[PDB]
Design an enzyme around this catalytic site. Structure first.
Site, short mmCIF file in Angstrom:
data_model
loop_
_atom_site.label_atom_id
_atom_site.label_comp_id
_atom_site.label_asym_id
_atom_site.label_seq_id
_atom_site.Cartn_x
_atom_site.Cartn_y
_atom_site.Cartn_z
N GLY B 260 0.79 -1.22 0.00
CA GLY B 260 0.00 0.00 0.00
C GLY B 260 0.82 1.27 0.00
N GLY B 262 2.05 4.82 1.35
CA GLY B 262 2.25 5.38 2.69
C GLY B 262 3.38 4.75 3.46
N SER B 263 3.84 5.42 4.52
CA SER B 263 5.11 5.09 5.19
C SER B 263 5.19 3.73 5.84
CB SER B 263 5.53 6.17 6.23
OG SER B 263 5.30 7.46 5.75
N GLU B 285 -0.21 -1.85 -6.84
CA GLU B 285 -0.92 -0.71 -7.38
C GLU B 285 0.01 0.47 -7.54
OE1 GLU B 285 -3.40 2.15 -4.94
OE2 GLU B 285 -4.96 0.83 -5.83
N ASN B 375 -9.01 9.58 3.27
CA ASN B 375 -8.69 9.63 1.81
C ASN B 375 -9.56 8.74 0.91
OD1 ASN B 375 -6.53 11.30 2.70
ND2 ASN B 375 -5.28 9.47 3.11
N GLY B 379 -7.24 0.96 -3.38
CA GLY B 379 -7.21 -0.41 -3.86
C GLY B 379 -7.23 -1.48 -2.75
#
Lengths: 495, 494
Positions: B260, B262-263, B285, B375, B379
């Protein structure tokens, strides 16, 4: 001899009791049976009887629910430690809700995927009901396929229960297909509802058959109720919707391949399509019920694929007494293939499934009363809803004489998030949710689907929630209050 | 140049001129997927011209936009509707105030709805491009997202050529549109590097209505360096993978990986550099810094994605020397990177971040306190549902301990417990596979929950079990932590 066409297997013919003695404490058993259809019967009956003499515990997997009070007998004899993936049995349901039996409801297409890729413990022994065994020793199932092909293949040993109550003319009805294997899996080569991609028998080496048991016992029949004013109203709202879609050029007159859920509402909604202009229908479903056959007889339904056939007593006698009338219009597949995401999305299925309750934001509960009490299981509803061209959920708008609303501020348990729900229908009307944001869905749901008893209270909740803001407005103090009011005071509005 | 069909040079015009073609009431389909490959000049001009002369539009993207584009359009009063995913604190505020209608969709599904009459078509497509070919076809930039479909659906297409992206991006993309129902055939993708489509978006050049020249980098990825906590999460997950491989339940090459945005997820992927696993592949993705770290480490063979979004130096390093990586990469429509048919066929191991999860395995990806959108589901649902292993990660607490990420009941379900196999926090890992709800609760409380929430949560569970049920709950108490947080600033302040 018409039934066991590999003569050397006749040495494995034995009593149900002798066969059940092959099942001992700590084993995992995979059994045929899907919504009353095609289940082993004599072996599990014998198993349950035996367990009252000397107890044991097993893990039991099926296709779906069992009839013949089999789950009841197993549960009462203390046989079940673990049960999956779906059950319809008030005794078992009670045991599960008391924590006495561990239940795992799985999306019906996914169990065999978990089994085949090391994510779930394999069955030690498979118990499969059969119409016949072929010259090669391969198994012809009866009224369902369900998970039986995978169970027969994965298990080290197979018990075949030949049931004289099903005709040998069932042979040809089934299309047994196992996907190719990761890391080099190829496409499921099905592009049409009546494609044959597999074989007519479950192929296994006959050496692994350890017992053949001869039985003669019908399937428990479907208990669908006749349609009533409310289910008729649901079907009429839905028909009006499809009519608007066709007249708008957004759908053709043959709709899309239809899937209809197990149970009276969905079956009654399908019967409702006889009174409609829609022609040349097809079905790509998980269960085929009376309504499948009413639609074929009406000349509306060209072809139906499923995993399981479950009919009311007379309809059952009519179909299986006169199979050649229907045989060219049917096929039975493993529930993995009848429900496969790749196939559901390829075909653009229109799925019609029953909700226990839904909320103003389009979330659907298919399973839990008060968020805690399991009914039957998510079943195939998530396989179809997620990937369907249209995911339609239906339910009467109230239950228990008005004491319960089927439309609530927030569902007590989520089986389908609002991302997987397109259309909602009660006797009160229909909410088209396509392209709508949460606040927009809420106004349409409240206007169209909610009972007059609950309309003002639900609108007050929504309006007070909106005052506190958010994409999806709620009152954390009140979101579950109707569920608590029912449980504590016997009516959702009793504060 | 760049505009390799000379008759199109005709359509070259300013961002302002092109933005004037966007009309009040229109649906607009734009390129842009988590900062990568968005149109920039045209939407910025739209926002500028709006606050003198309002319109309102419905805007669809691949996913989120950088360059404060959602903020500018929101402030100019341009957005009546927005989908399917946004990362913008100004827009989020508008969405939470009911000022903009937001629809978060599973990312693979939007184009399926569009093509089957279930969602209003874009009237106009605005697509950032590295080049237009001899045939008037569009070579996208650093993402594909929904751009192939948008260009094809829309009656008119605005192409924004961005000189900051090199023309050597051509060859990176595999633009594939599924065959149509009712005669649809399979998606013929069986390996992570299969080429099933074209390197440019096929449209008749006649639909191109404006060409805008811009020179402006993508906003960089905001992923942070890994800390002690994300490292501990990566390490719990590596130990689990080791147990699986050791037990013959997994290969030493794992399965095709999806990580995914993000951090935390990016940091977990970096964790795999310090592991025994070899010959990895990604079918993801988004592709982030960790993709390229894993390639450089010699761990990762190949990565498929829809979008590449990087840190500024990594960005400079990768696109400064694309030949180093070009044979190990492919970019696909988001429909295809996330397609259920491909995800299940390939047996993806998906690693995505939870906002919060509950003791029964349900995951919230989007809503604070059940009401406030962050947000979008993104996916995460396409992958989690159909993955071989659906793994969700999060730090166990937030706001100095005032918030637990593990709760009695999630305030908002994005993933039911049916789509969640493995849960991981810095505290430990819960393997939920084949477990009934009451079994899941014990494992999650033991392994994932912060010491300071462990006993309150166990108390909830044990008290809920006394009222019975397959999935025990206290209806009075199930949402109380979220109410406590909101009323009193701490989940445990009743």
């Amino acid at each position: 001899r018409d039934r066991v066409r590999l003569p050397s297997l006749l040495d494995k013919v034995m009593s149900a009791a002798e066969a059940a003695d092959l099942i001992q404490d700590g084993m995992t058993v995979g059994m045929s049976g899907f919504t009353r259809a095609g289940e082993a019967k004599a072996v599990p009956q014998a198993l349950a009887m035996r367990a009252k003499e000397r107890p044991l515990r097993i893990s039991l997997m099926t296709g779906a629910s069992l009839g013949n009070d089999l789950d009841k007998q197993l549960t009462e004899a203390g046989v079940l430690a673990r049960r999956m993936p779906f059950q319809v049995d008030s005794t078992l349901r009670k045991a599960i809700n008391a924590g006495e039996v561990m239940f795992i409801d799985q999306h019906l297409s996914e169990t065999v995927e978990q089994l085949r890729n090391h994510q779930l413990k394999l069955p030690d022994i498979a118990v499969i009901e059969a119409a016949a065994i072929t010259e090669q020793g391969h198994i012809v199932p009866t009224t369902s396929v369900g998970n039986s092909a995978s169970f027969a293949i994965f298990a080290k040993q197979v018990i075949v229960e030949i049931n004289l109550a099903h005709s040998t003319n069932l042979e040809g009805l089934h299309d047994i297909y196992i996907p190719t294997y990761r890391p080099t899996r190829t496409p499921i080569p099905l592009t049409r509802v009546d494609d044959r991609i597999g074989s007519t028998a479950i192929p296994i080496p006959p050496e692994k058959i350890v017992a053949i048991v001869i039985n003669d016992q019908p399937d428990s029949p479907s208990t669908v109720l006749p349609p009533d004013g409310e289910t008729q109203a649901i079907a009429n709202h839905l028909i009006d919707f499809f009519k608007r879609e066709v007249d708008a050029g957004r759908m053709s007159n043959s709709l899309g391949p239809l899937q209809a859920g197990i149970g009276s509402i969905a079956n009654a909604v399908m019967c409702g399509l006889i009174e409609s202009p829609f022609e040349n229908l097809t079905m790509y479903s998980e269960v085929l019920q009376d309504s499948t056959f009413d639609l074929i007889d009406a000349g509306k339904l060209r072809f139906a694929s499923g995993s399981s056939i479950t009919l009311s007593p007379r309809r059952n006698a009519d179909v299986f007494g006169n199979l050649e009338r229907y045989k060219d219009k049917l096929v039975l597949r493993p529930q993995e293939i009848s429900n496969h995401p790749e196939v559901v999305r390829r075909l653009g299925i229109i799925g019609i499934n029953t909700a226990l309750e839904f909320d103003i934001y389009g979330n659907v509960n298919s399973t839990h009363v008060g968020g805690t009490k399991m009914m039957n299981g998510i079943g195939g509803s998530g396989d179809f809803a997620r990937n369907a061209h249209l995911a339609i959920f239906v339910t009467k708008s109230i239950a228990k004489g008005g004491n319960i609303s089927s439309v609530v501020p927030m569902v007590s348990h989520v089986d389908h998030t609002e991302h997987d729900v397109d259309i909602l229908v009660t006797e009160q009307g229909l909410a088209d949710l396509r392209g709508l944001a949460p606040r927009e869905r809420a106004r349409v749901i409240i206007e169209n689907c909610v009972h007059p008893s609950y309309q003002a209270p639900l609108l007050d909740y929504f309006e007070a929630a909106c005052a506190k803001g958010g994409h999806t407005p709620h009152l954390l103090r009140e979101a579950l209050a109707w569920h608590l009011n029912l449980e504590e005071r016997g009516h959702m509005l009793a504060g």
